């Protein structure tokens with residue numbers, strides 16, 4: 001399966017951790033946006049939204065949005081290991097609702113406000129610190145972001161985001177639960193060293 | 204189930220339509236925000252029969268299908284197909300709605316209607332917002348619904364709530380033929396479309 005990506009990119013890193021978790025090997029297709037590779041007609045025909053990560057499966061199914069990719073990887077490839085899929089993406093409606101809630105929080109608030117503050121300011125700073133405070137509150141008395149006894153795809157997505165906060169230069173130790181979760185989760189998730197490595201070397 | 208909401212809110216309206224679709228009656232609780240009435244004070248907030256608290260409209264939408272619609276397997280399958288590939292397209296459209304379509308709407312219009320009330324729209328934000336509409340128009344080329352299928356999915360409902368907000372904002376949706384066609388057709392057929400239209404009008408109070 002072809003994986004159109006950039007090394008420093010958080011959503012790409014989330015997908016790489018998820019693929020490693022389900023034993024999927026990705027055919028890496030570096031897609032340099034500065035060079036305009038995502039705007040070539042070959043890419044546009046695959047993905048009209050011209051964004052990375054983009055996954056092309058064995059039957060030519062094309063998918064983008066890292067968090068939809070994560071779910072697809074578990075449902076289609078993780079499913080061969082029943083307990084594994086359950087750990088990554090619990091099936092109970094309530095448990096799964098929380099995983100979804102955290103994924104939507106990651107894209108619309110946590111990573112969003114990171115991009116709002118760092119890519120162009122006291123206003124967008126307070127906006128971002130609020131996102132971190134929310135996350136800190138989510139992790140109060142909890143090992144993982146959506147609960148559970150094991151990391152879920154929500155942890156993997158937020159690990160990608162938070163490693164970007166770290167390399168940006170934000171003092172994460174300010175959020176005791178976030179720092180704690182970040183350290184312990186990075187130590188236990190397969191390919192999490194590649195996440196930080198890739199955040200650092202590129203991002 | 205208690206539903207903490209405001210009619211003007213697109214995320215709230217997406218849940219109302221989804222609940223209508225699964226035959227769930229919501230006990231509506233008006234939560235006036237500018238007054239200050241879930242440690243993120245997010246609306247909508249759903250509180251189920253066991254006191255389980257959920258926010259994030261799109262997570263709520265899925266939960267409503269999975270728990271309250273799944274007795275009618277054919278209905279749940281229509282709203283939220285289980286085939287990984289089909290479900291993946293529905294998930295990508297939900298993520299697009301939150302992070303691209305509604306997000307760029309907000310980034311363009313919120314500075315003009317809230318806080319400082321900037322006298323003019325940012326052209327870069329406008330271009331970006333129009334790009335989001337073009338994407339949607341493209342997704343709808345040759346397709347009845349946003350994520351495909353023979354029937355509306357929850358992605359259609361989420362986007363319907365967002366697009367009705369574009370309309371009350373005064374954006375000329377006729378510029379995007381597929382979007383307009385889909386918007387008319389879907390508004391004509393989905394449960395709770397009346398709540399969506401009624402509520403979107405309310406959000407028009409910020410555009411006078």
Ligand SMILES: N[C@H](CCC(=O)N[C@@H](CS)C(=O)NCC(=O)O)C(=O)O
Pocket residue numbers: 009010011033038049050051052053064065066067107302
């Ligand atoms: N919601 C994000 C989208 C990430 C995204 O928009 N990718 C950026 C680079 S990190 C990109 O491809 N930008 C180029 C473009 O959208 O035209 C995801 O998790 O996949």
